[PDB]
Design a protein around this ligand. Structure first.
Ligand SMILES: [Zn+2]
Ligand SMILES: [Zn+2]
Ligand SMILES: [Zn+2]
Length: 230
């Protein structure tokens, strides 16, 4: 029942309910000759919402806000981008203009600036080194170490044991490590191991692109990245 890339035209956004007050959002985008799906998260924060990642671009993110209004009907007040690529920060300006407080680590902000991407405005403190974790409303933010990018964060929702891996975690469908332009292939398996050790009770694991699954998405990722690296 999870929305697939084949089912979502570019410009449309789907929501998928994972638990009471937890949704993923799914969008698609034209990239490097293909159409890719992309996931983010929505977590209820009292009578407000916390958004994890944009929907990969301004038009997609505007559609996301519209979809949230008609499906959930609570305001997005804060957003966190989990690394500096456009599928995570592309749309930050739309969010900011809509009244949303956009957040990222200092590293992500720096890298977004350097890449010419939109820059989340507010800085997350306490995430500078491997293994660091902080609470942020209804979620925990965790820096597992460099992986898909040097700055990538993962997000855990303890109310539902939902682990949002973002792009540091690969879907089972991936046969390569994907876009590795900014990746640390040497560190990535160790960073996955940190996630495995810190979140052993995760029920659901959501990758940055493609279908959610269980904990074996983590070991899958380590396996693919190690094979790639070799
Ligand atoms: Zn990325
Ligand atoms: Zn602000
Ligand atoms: Zn990605």
């Amino acid at each position: 029942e999870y929305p697939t890339v084949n089912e979502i035209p570019v410009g449309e956004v789907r929501l998928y309910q994972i638990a009471d007050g937890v949704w993923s959002h799914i969008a698609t985008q034209s990239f490097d000759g293909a159409v890719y799906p992309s996931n983010g998260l929505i977590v209820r924060d009292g009578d407000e919402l916390l958004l994890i990642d944009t929907a990969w671009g301004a038009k997609n993110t505007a559609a996301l806000l519209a979809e949230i209004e008609k499906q959930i009907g609570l305001p997005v007040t804060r957003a966190v981008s989990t690394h500096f690529h456009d599928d995570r920060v592309g749309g930050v300006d739309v969010l900011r203009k809509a009244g949303v407080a956009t957040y990222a680590s200092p590293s992500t902000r720096r890298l977004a600036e350097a890449e010419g991407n939109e820059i989340p405005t507010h800085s997350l403190e306490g995430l500078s080194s491997s293994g660091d974790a902080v609470r942020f409303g209804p979620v925990e933010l965790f820096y597992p170490g460099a992986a898909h990018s040097t700055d990538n964060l993962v997000v855990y929702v303890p109310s539902a044991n939902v682990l949002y891996g973002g792009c540091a975690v690969l879907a089972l469908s991936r046969t390569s490590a994907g876009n590795v332009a900014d990746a640390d292939l040497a560190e990535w398996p160790t960073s996955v191991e940190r996630i495995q050790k810190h979140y052993p009770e995760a029920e659901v694991v959501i990758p940055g692109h493609g279908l959610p699954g269980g904990l074996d998405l983590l070991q899958h990722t380590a396996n693919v990245v190690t094979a790639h690296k070799n």
